[PDB]
A paper describes a structure:
Antifreeze proteins (AFPs) inhibit ice growth by adsorbing onto specific ice planes.
Indeed, both substitutions resulted in a reduced TH activity (0.4 °C at 0.25 mM T20Y mutant and 0.45 °C at 0.27 mM A214Y mutant), equivalent to a 60% and 50% reduction from wild-type TisAFP7, accordingly. Panels 1 and 2, the T20Y mutant covered only the perimeter zone of the hemisphere, corresponding to the secondary prism planes. The water network of TisAFP7 was less extensive than that of TisAFP8. This prompted us to propose that the antifreeze activity of TisAFPs, typically reflecting the affinity toward the ice basal plane, is correlated with the water coverage on IBS via the extended network of water molecules, as observed in the current study.
Numbering used by the authors: 1 to 223
Amino acid sequence: AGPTAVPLGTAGNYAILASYAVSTVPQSAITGAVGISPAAGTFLTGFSLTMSGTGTFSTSTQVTGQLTAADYGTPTPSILTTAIGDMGTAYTNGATRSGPDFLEIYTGALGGTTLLPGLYKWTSSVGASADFTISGTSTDTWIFQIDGTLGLAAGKKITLAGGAQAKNIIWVVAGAVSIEAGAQFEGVILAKTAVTLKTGSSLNGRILAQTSVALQSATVVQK
Ligand SMILES: [Mg+2]
């Protein structure tokens, strides 16, 4: 049940992929790669980077995986060029799906809901002032098309019931994304603009943002 997957291509090789900037207030806890392009590595801030012997990638105690930037040694820039392209294709693939299963459901106020599989369209912002559940099997899919902002209020949680998998939940979001302090998010974010995870928030999925990403001592576990 639910729509055909959004293929991330090589954007699925990153925990975080951004074009303008990635900032962390330590101590963030990122499982997977961090890439920035076309911006340079000086727009990776707060990571206390060490450049590794080849000059092609850097390391941080905040990241289990490699950081890469567009100014790094060959062939890193070509790799990120492809990843940024594949994120653009993924966003458009998700945003342009037609025939939604749910249209303006709950007016985009998702507190206390249980969301079954399908294609969701909101011509609005989406927020949640309370915990909500995504409920489906390990093979079901969700695509959440959001014309405005996406938020999850402080300390609130998305629960996966039934076997539902974060990698099968795509948030395709035109406006800014704000996960508030201590909130627990589930799914891949394909953001057209900025994504911010505030103090002690966590995301099981990926952050694939066409502008900036801001982390405040936040957890990103790639799914
Ligand atoms: Mg609500």
